[PDB]
């Protein structure tokens, strides 16, 4: 349920999950699975995953 900023660039790779860029907002729908969370972006609204240890 919480919020982030992506701390550096990023390009999605395998495309169900989402690409950022440098200042971006997004919040956390579900880390559960550990190595990727269920997120969206706040400025756009775009969803998908990503990677946790890019804001964990």
Not at 35 to 47: A, I, K, N, Q
């Amino acid at each position: 349920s919480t919020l982030f900023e992506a701390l550096y660039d990023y390009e999605a790779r395998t495309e169900d999950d989402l690409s950022f860029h440098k200042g971006e907002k997004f919040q956390i729908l579900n880390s559960s699975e550990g190595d990727w969370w269920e997120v969206r972006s706040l400025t756009t609204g775009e969803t998908g995953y990503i990677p946790s240890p890019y804001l964990a």
